[PDB]
Amino acid sequence: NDPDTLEIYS
Amino acid sequence: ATQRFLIEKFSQEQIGENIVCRVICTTGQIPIRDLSADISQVLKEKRSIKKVWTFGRNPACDYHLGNISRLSNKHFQILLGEDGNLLLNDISTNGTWLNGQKVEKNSNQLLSQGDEITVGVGVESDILSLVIFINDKFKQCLEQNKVDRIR
Known part of the structure; x- marks a missing residue:
């Protein structure tokens, strides 16, 4: 019940 | 005939009710939708x-x-207006791509015929592509911009 925004891992 | 007529429409569907553009996934992930x-x-x-x-x-x-991490709640936005043509707007965190070219977020761009938007860039395995199909029917009416029929 929650979103998830990111920008690749490094 | 009455009930039979309803069945006839089952096979022969009338496409082009008031469609602006159509979104089709080429990478095979999301089902086709009509704007x-x-x-x-x-x-x-x-x-x-x-x-x-x-x-x-x-x-x-x-x-x-598809619920992807690389994509945001509202990955992108498409707008139709102005003196004809369509506009494509990006609203993703990881960015929105157009034919391999990364466009400016929340920016309006001139639509393209059968254009394609790529998303989830950053990871070679985390990119998703989408193709936009624009119907000529919509443009036909816009050209005439004249009303003379009901529905």
């Missing part, structure tokens, strides 16, 4: 955009795609 707008509204509205679609993993978004 539409009211002609009466477009003809009446002289300023601002007639109608805009929001795409993302959110069920609110006018478009629902």
Whole structure:
């Protein structure tokens, strides 16, 4: 019940 | 005939009710969807955009795609208005791509015939592509911009 925004891992 | 008539429409569906553009996934992930707008509204509205679609993993978004981390709630937005043609707007965190070219977020761009938007850039295995199919029917009416029929 929650979103998830990111920008690749490094 | 009565009930039989309803069945006839089952096989022969009337496409082009008031569709603006169509979204098709080429990478095979999200089911094809059709974007539409009211002609009466477009003809009446002289300023601002007639109608805009929001795409993302959110069920609110006018478009629902696979719940991907690389994508945002509202990954991108499509707007149709102005003196014809269509506009494509990006609203993703990780960025929105057009034919391999990364466009400016929340920026309006001139639509392309059969254009394609790529998303989830950063990881070779985390990119998703989408193709936009624009129907000529919509443009036909816009060219005439004249009302002379009901529905």
